[PDB]
Symmetry: C2
């Protein structure tokens, strides 16, 4: 049973991942994904969510008073607060496995210029906070990263998304010949020990070529 709350100024961004949960998992109460418009917690008629950065510079910083109120309402002592940011610790498959057994994830989506750091710092005094980056690139905001994180975590929770080192090598299916290219004959050989060795060599070669950092 996992609850995920997402807070964002673009709640529509998260709607297709909500309609991505098998009804069987929701009815079994294994998962609940709720999305919240951050502007619900604004104070002013203009519904302001950001303000100019102290110390000067470009862009805007998200307001601590707004985020503080939102997290106060949404989070509990059991919450793992996830903050996607290009300045975060790396989000990896290990992270995904760890978070897959959490009871309550709250994902705070902000612009990449940032949420006022006092929000995370305050939250960390009463819950666990994880500022994470999904890769070495900048996105305008955390929403697309939230989708990646939700998917990577929930596909590891038994029966939730409906699904059941070295890089994986190439895969093939019918037909055996297509546009002048044949499926590697070893795969049709019925020698399953040899197929495993062939796949291992394919994996080695691909990892050397594409991800030498992994060796």
């Amino acid at each position: 049973s996992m609850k995920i709350d997402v807070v964002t100024i673009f709640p529509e961004y998260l709607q297709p991942v909500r309609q991505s949960l098998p009804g069987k998992a929701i009815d079994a109460g294994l998962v609940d994904v709720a999305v919240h418009d951050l502007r619900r917690w604004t104070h002013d008629v203009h519904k302001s969510v950001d303000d100019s950065p102290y110390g000067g510079g470009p862009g805007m910083v998200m307001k601590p008073t707004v985020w503080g109120d939102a997290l106060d309402e949404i989070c509990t002592s059991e919450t793992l607060l996830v903050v996607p940011t290009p300045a975060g610790y790396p989000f990896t498959q290990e992270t995904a496995w760890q978070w897959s057994t959490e009871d309550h994830l709250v994902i705070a989506c902000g612009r990449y210029e940032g949420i006022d750091q006092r929000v995370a710092d305050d939250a960390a005094t009463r819950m666990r906070v994880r500022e994470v980056s999904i890769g070495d690139y900048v996105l305008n905001g955390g929403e697309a990263a939230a989708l990646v994180i939700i998917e990577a975590v929930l596909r590891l929770v038994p029966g939730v998304l409906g699904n059941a080192s070295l890089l994986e090598g190439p895969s093939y299916t019918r037909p055996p010949s297509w546009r002048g290219m044949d499926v590697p004959p070893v795969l049709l050989s019925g020698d399953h020990a040899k197929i495993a060795a062939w796949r291992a060599e394919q994996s080695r070669q691909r990892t050397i070529e594409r991800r030498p950092d992994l060796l």
Copy 2:
């Protein structure tokens, strides 16, 4: 302007592209994003896009015939074909800068255990092909990765326009008993720059020591 075509068996999952940054780029006419249902290029009644692997293994592999017909229709020799996959070359900030200059991206979204390798091999005889990983984690399909790639690229396109950024702050100067660092309120540009540079380098060695050439945790 730029054209982005996305091919997927879940066209609805790509609707977030209409939000925020990509949505604004589209409304400004700086990019045209078109999403295509792969099943459009099937012919059987069941609209099958997958089949079991040769050589054994779990799951299903996407059929080359359907993909070949789709890419035939959508791609030209000038196309940059993007295939998101955990087995890909890393997608980085540099990649995003490079692709921001392209006339035409086609993003082929796979599911299950991926796409028959001959699809990319065949395409590479006509156009440039890039199989890329957005990070070291596994997803159920390439759709969310397509959204990440589109976001990272579009914010760099003309018309929209190392180290970790340190903490940022805004009003009020004191909140819940936590104060904004005094230097940031001091108006001393030089001291502010120096503090920010230091905060950047300190956050980097704590969170991303690899960026400064040190061992990772």
